[PDB]
Ligand binder design. Structure first.
Ligand SMILES: Nc1ncnc2c1ncn2[C@@H]1O[C@H](COP(=O)(O)OP(=O)(O)OP(=O)(O)O)[C@@H](O)[C@H]1O
Ligand SMILES: O=P(O)(O)OC[C@@H]1O[C@H](CO)[C@@H](OP(=O)(O)O)[C@H](OP(=O)(O)O)[C@H]1O
Ligand SMILES: [Mn+2]
Length: 275
């Protein structure tokens, strides 16, 4: 029905207009959503209606993706082999900010993961933490990871930090769709059409897409949709330079593995459909 309904039961606020939601404005994301409304990917992203002022702060006015659903189930999938900008590697070499928060979450999952010096510091750099997170999840090997589920029973979970194997990922989607063959068929048709759109998009060949998600939404009436969201770390390549979005990332090449991820995700859902 609406996201703010679920919120009530960080960057999001309720809109006055029915079927809309407000997200805190960031300049990279505003730039991206403006370009996307004129791109092949227009129908694969939430409608962007412009910027509004609320309590002396700027908000993006977005389509509420939950509006058309009756008690929506939601799964957020972070896309890419890399989840941080290359500039973070330069900042950590020249002038590191030590993160005590990030050391604690590391310790919790694997006490043996931090180095002798990190244990002494009780702190790690951002790129070190994010690379570790990529390696214990499916990010490094499959090019995507499950971040969270919000269920129609009001229950939610973010307990997926060690979901890594192809079969572990398949079991999360198996539980999410609860044997609804129509929802799974509609998700697979939508992902195939999104892949075709990405492969011809003028926006996609010219931009590094880091930290974006695919948002899966379905309901008990068998309605099913998928959209790209979160363009806060999506940046244009210099000159007339393009990415293939499949080849491995090496510092300098700005590759994101986005389509390696989408290829693997379609393969897993196609496998699940034949079980
Ligand atoms: N247009 C939308 N309509 C409905 N729900 C949305 C919409 N955009 C985002 N959401 C919800 O908000 C969540 C967070 O979205 P998003 O990733 O854009 O935010 P964020 O604050 O940048 O988070 P992060 O950067 O940590 O991933 C999504 O997983 C989804 O549940
Ligand atoms: O491992 P998780 O699930 O707990 O997520 C950790 C958080 O992942 C965010 C991305 O989703 C980062 O944000 P940006 O990438 O927009 O910069 C946060 O970074 P900062 O703390 O530096 O803002 C980081 O703490
Ligand atoms: Mn996000």
């Amino acid at each position: 029905g609406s996201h703010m309904s679920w919120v009530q039961l960080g960057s999001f606020k309720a809109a006055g207009t029915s079927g809309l939601i407000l997200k805190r404005c960031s300049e990279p994301e505003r730039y991206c959503l403006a370009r996307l409304m004129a791109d092949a990917l227009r129908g694969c992203v939430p409608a962007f209606h412009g910027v509004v002022e609320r309590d002396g702060e700027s908000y993006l006015q977005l389509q509420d993706l939950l509006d058309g659903f009756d008690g929506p189930c939601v799964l957020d999938c972070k896309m890419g082999v890399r989840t941080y900008l290359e500039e973070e590697l330069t900042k950590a070499r020249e002038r590191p900010k030590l993160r005590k928060d990030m050391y604690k979450k590391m310790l919790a999952v694997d006490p043996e993961a931090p180095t002798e010096e990190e244990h002494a510091q009780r702190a790690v750099t951002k790129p070190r933490y994010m690379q570790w997170r990529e390696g214990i999840s499916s990010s490094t090997t499959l090019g995507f990871r499950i971040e969270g589920i919000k269920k129609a029973d009001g229950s939610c979970s973010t307990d997926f930090k060690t979901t890594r194997s192809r079969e572990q990922v398949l079991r999360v989607f198996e539980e999410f769709v609860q044997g609804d063959e129509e929802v799974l068929r509609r998700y697979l048709n939508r992902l195939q059409q999104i892949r075709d759109t990405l492969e011809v998009s003028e926006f996609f060949r010219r931009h590094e897409v880091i930290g974006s998600s695919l948002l899966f939404v379905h309901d008990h009436c068998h309605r099913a949709g998928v959209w790209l969201i979160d363009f806060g770390k999506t940046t244009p390549l210099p000159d007339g330079q393009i990415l293939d979005h499949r080849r491995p990332w090496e510092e300098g090449n700005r590759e994101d593995g986005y389509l390696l991820g989408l290829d693997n995700l379609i393969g897993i859902l196609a496998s699940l459909a034949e079980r």
